[PDB]
Amino acid sequence: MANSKNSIFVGGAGRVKQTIEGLAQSAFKPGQLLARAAGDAIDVTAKASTTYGNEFLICDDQPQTLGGGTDVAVTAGDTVQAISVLPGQYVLLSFAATQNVTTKGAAVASNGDGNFKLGNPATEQTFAVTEEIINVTTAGTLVLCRAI
Amino acid sequence: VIESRRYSEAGRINRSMSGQTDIDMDKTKSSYQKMVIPVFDGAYGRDFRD
């Protein structure tokens, strides 16, 4: 595989990431959309797809010295290190099933389950823009996208 | 008048486990409080023949 996908923040050689720490509530996989809640705990979003004003908050992969990878789920009830995405960076998202990415530059909406999808940019908040031409069939595949 | 300065306290901190959570800055304001310096004096004296 010439496109190795073992780091969820691949967005330039001079751009550092912005980290939002917090507590866990469930066991999600790295690369999914999050939403902070009451107390100081983070979990999956579970908001509607047609709701604006959400912050671009994805789950960073955990450190190598804590048993973390791009497919290892997080341990519940602990400190999950996340990423707030600035506009103009590339990040590996995680799409849903049965959608093909044909052109580099389509709009990336947010599904209600914590994954992303190609939606019409007239009724949902556009988070990012596609940057890789692949076709996915299993829910949970990593697709490169630019956050602008 | 001897006006002296009295600055404030400052600082917002933030805790983390990874340590990279956008360290955040502050400074100090100021205000002044003044006093006054008057002059006291006194004298004494006798005559010549005494």
B15 Cα to chain A: minimum distance (Å) = 9
Q: How far is CA A79 from CA A62, A92, A102, A132, in A?
A: 10, 21, 37, 32
Q: How far is Cα of residue B43 from the mean position of the Cα atoms in its chain?
A: 36
Within 8 A of B18 by CB-CB distance, chain A residues are 19, 21, 63, 81
Distance CA B12, CA B23 (A): 9
Distance CA A22, CA A37 (A): 10
Listed resolution, Å: 3.6
Distance CA B39, CA B50 (A): 32
Within 8 A of A81 by CB-CB distance, chain B residues are 17-18
Which residue type, as a one-letter code, is found at position A41? A
B20 part of contact set with chain A, CB < 8 Å: yes
Domain that holds residue A121: 1-148
Give A143's strand partners: A93
Best of B14, B15, B21 to disrupt the A interface (most A CBs within 10 Å) is B21
Residue A65, phi then psi, degrees to nearest 5 = -90, 25
Within 8 A of B20 by CB-CB distance, chain A residues are 16-17, 19
| Nearest chain B residue to A22, by CA | B16
Distance CA A55, CA A82 (A): 12
* Number of A–B residue contacts, CB under 8 Å: 17
Tell me the CB-side half-sphere exposure of residue A67, using CA atoms within 13 A: 4
Closest CA to A148 of A63, A56, A48: A56
A119 Cα to chain B: minimum distance (Å) = 32
Give A96's strand partners: none
A142 Cα to chain B: minimum distance (Å) = 25
DSSP 8-state assignment for residue B14: -
Distance CA B49, CA B9 (A): 68
* Tally of domains within chain A: 1
Give A90's strand partners: A146
Distance CA A21, CA A82 (A): 6
Elucidation technique: cryo-EM
Closest CA to A32 of A50, A23, A48, A44: A44
Q: Which tokens hold the place of A58?
A: 């994805």
B24 part of contact set with chain A, CB < 8 Å: no
Q: Are A35 and A54 in contact (CB under 8 A)?
A: yes
